[model samples]
Target: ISLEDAIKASNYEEINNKVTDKKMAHQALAYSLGNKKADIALYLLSKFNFTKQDVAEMEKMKNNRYCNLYDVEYLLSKDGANYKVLEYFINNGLVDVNKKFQKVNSGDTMLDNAMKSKDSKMIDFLLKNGAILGKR
Candidate 1:
């Protein structure tokens, strides 16, 4: 019944049933998977009638501390350094690659946070996707 147990079983049906809706289950799975299964996540969104705006919100939630990339990577069996989720958001115009979380008072852009965390893969991914250093 636990989220971890559900994910370990890959029992999307049971997970969906337990979560009360397909979208919530898929979001939980996406968070668990660190956005690695982006293609599948997109498919799930389609099934659940998620709009582009919904995807943007999902992106924000994933980056939020409540479901940080570390948890995602752990569940998805992916290299924590992978930045596919960030790239997907940027490529799809779902989020501003340069946008910083408003809650952070340090004025750190997403790139700034990545740099501060020493996440070179994220740095490379952002730069490759047109992120540039700014004085914000």
Candidate 2:
């Protein structure tokens, strides 16, 4: 099956934790996010041990004009979610929140987005994750 199909099928283990294939993993993950497939995208967003290039690509996917807020919110540790794509990036040295993926005012910092969305939980999460306040 195609990666999209596998994603639609919810075969997360295969797509999120690859063994011998890049087949339906991060590419699928990125595709899902870029295409607005949040149910699948959010599932795959935190499953990376990414390089800087991977970070840039994901930044592109998550940094469009609507703001990268969706990316951050989708990756938050919500009630039913078991992932942290933002934290994953941070731990792997992929993000610096305020300065990492600047693109006009289209995409600012996580703290900025968090407040914009009025998401106190996400705001708190960013703070705990070493997100520098007002540093954006």
Candidate 3:
């Protein structure tokens, strides 16, 4: 079922049950078009068994500028000031803070992206979690 349908129905149990595999469940939840539902999906998936592949997939997805990290950070930041999510990436060794993804046409690194987004908390969190400043 689509995430919207599941959330509108408040059928989290159904959404949870529809996803039989751990990875599929997390992916659905992680990439859900609906932010609130996606958040719920992440929380639910957290209760299940996450394999190495699951972790790897999550890391890759987050690292993608067009993917989950931007949204996840936005969501987490709205709720509180904890850097638990950033710490999770660091503690799991899923991120390479110093590893550049690619230089933008304007010569910007991931750090620049964070700065441009005005996510100072995320910038601080990333740095504290081992994201090194990239050489220009």
lDDT of 1 by residue, 48-123 (tens): 6534556445544643443443322122212333355455446666556655444433344566656666777777
Off by over 4 Å in 2: 12-24, 32-48, 57-83, 100-107, 132-136
TM-scores of all predicted structures: 0.55, 0.53, 0.55
Shift in Å, residue 52, candidate 2: 2.7
Worst 10 residues of 3 by lDDT: 73-82
**Clash count, one per candidate:** 0, 0, 0
Question: Compared to the true structure, candidate 2 yields what TM-score?
Answer: 0.53
Per-residue alpha-carbon lDDT of candidate 3 for residues 62-135, written as tens digits (9 for 90 to 100): 32332343433333232222244434544556445444433222223445455656777777866665555446
2 or 3, greater by lDDT: 2
Please give, for residues 1-136, the per-residue lDDT of candidate 2 as tens digits. 6555566577766555542333334456555544445666545544544566655554455324322543433333222232345555556666565543244343455566567676676677778777753442
Candidate 3, overall lDDT?
A: 0.49
Higher-TM-score candidate of 2 and 3: 3
**How far is 86's C-alpha from truth in model 3 (Å)?**
4.1
